[PDB]
């Protein structure tokens, strides 16, 4: 089965904590960072050192590929990426279109949907 891949976005303070952990390579990252997805498939909780962050799975506008390389000249596609798990410091941890993201990940694709995508003409 195809490997599933997606982007995790953390608030900057938490992202820093996690990045140092990824870089150290310590096994305990597995306890220090956990992801829980709720039954609705859109909301969830990311935990950094047991601190719960309200999270939402959103749909990115641009198709994004991850490509792996050995020599840095030839590249092999490993996956299509089209979703992002966005964690915030406020929000309902357990919440009772708003899942459409409007921006690409990179700077120039700000507002891609509204500014840089030819829109379809019906009929």
């Amino acid at each position: 089965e195809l490997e599933s891949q997606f982007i995790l976005r953390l608030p900057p303070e938490y992202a820093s904590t996690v990045r140092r952990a990824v870089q150290s390579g310590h096994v305990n990252l597995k306890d220090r960072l956990t992801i829980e997805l709720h039954p609705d498939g859109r909301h969830g909780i990311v935990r950094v050192d047991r601190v719960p962050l309200a999270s939402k799975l959103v749909d990115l506008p641009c198709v994004m590929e991850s490509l792996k390389t050995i020599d840095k000249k030839t590249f092999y596609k490993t996956a299509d990426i089209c979703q992002m798990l966005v964690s915030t410091v406020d929000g309902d941890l357990y919440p009772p279109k708003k899942f459409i993201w409007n921006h690409g990940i990179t700077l120039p694709l700000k507002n891609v949907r509204k500014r840089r995508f030819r829109k379809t003409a019906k009929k």
Binding site: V22, D59, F75, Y76, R116
Partner: protein, 406 residues
Amino acid sequence: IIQHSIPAVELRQPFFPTHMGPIKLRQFHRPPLKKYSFGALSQPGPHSVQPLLKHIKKKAKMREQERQASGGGEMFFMRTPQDLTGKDGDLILAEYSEENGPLMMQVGMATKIKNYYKRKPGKDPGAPDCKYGETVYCHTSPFLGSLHPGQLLQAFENNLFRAPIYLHKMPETDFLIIRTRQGYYIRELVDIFVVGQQCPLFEVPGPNSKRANTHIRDFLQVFIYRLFWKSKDRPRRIRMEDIKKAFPSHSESSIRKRLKLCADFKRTGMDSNWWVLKSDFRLPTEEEIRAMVSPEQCCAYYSMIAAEQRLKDAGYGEKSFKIDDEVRTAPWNTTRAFIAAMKGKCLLEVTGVADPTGCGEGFSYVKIPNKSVAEHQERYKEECQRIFDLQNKVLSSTEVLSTDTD
């Protein structure tokens, strides 16, 4: 020369789907996270996100040793589906600026990065170095506009398309999560390329063209041979049901066509019967099967059916594909137009309804005749040049915009 991974070269599933329904076509190259029915991550609650650093180093080390053990030089490493994981090797991200570009790779396919450079006049000291890709010194432009002297432009280059790319930095907030039935894994990822509009190098077929019909036929034929090869029974045998499940839009009668030359129907007292390989039929070799259908041909075909689905959804019937604007955006028209122009058979509109950005930062691939005729071509080049430069400037820019409140 592009060498794809073995699973891709062999057109294995799920890397090369045999059939896609309307829903899959709408979601083409945008697979949504779907819940697991079993395995660790089918369970409720928090799940560990695992580090990959020790694993990444180990795999790089193992690969280099295998390299030195035979006994240097160049090795090909992408032999198994396991070699295609995001869990090891160096990784980049590529974000495509076209919402649905005319050609896209499947998982397991390969592309090169070329660094196109135009020498400064006189004493050029050479191109700047880049972290990725191989430098190409070009006197003529591989794009619609020309490079300026001293200009470096990076690009994806393969058999489907060539496209300028622009290296950016991943936001500090963002990580890559790999998700399997067994667990989550996390990698740092710092290099992300923006991909500009494609220059298609492979022609996408039209719906129900002879080319399209020949392709599904040949692909079905390949799937069948591979079924016989997988069979451990002697004489080899396969079940109709397995073919029908992979090709649910084929009639049993059309499948019997592909089977009548290589196999015999064996009837049993049960609604499951076998097709047994004829004893005087020689099964094609691995090498011969690969030659039948390439990954690129599958990509061209996928492009067509996905576009065809989007057109139906927008109300455009099969009788529409004198021509509607939306139909002009279809990959069979845009690729055909671009390739013809590349061969000097015509020019391109450039400014027009098929501009994928909708805002003048992309090219409209629509044929205009070669038909003051030095001014006609100079105006075409001028316009190409302007849009070429505009795209490079906008997509390479690190300017922070500014959410549109509308």
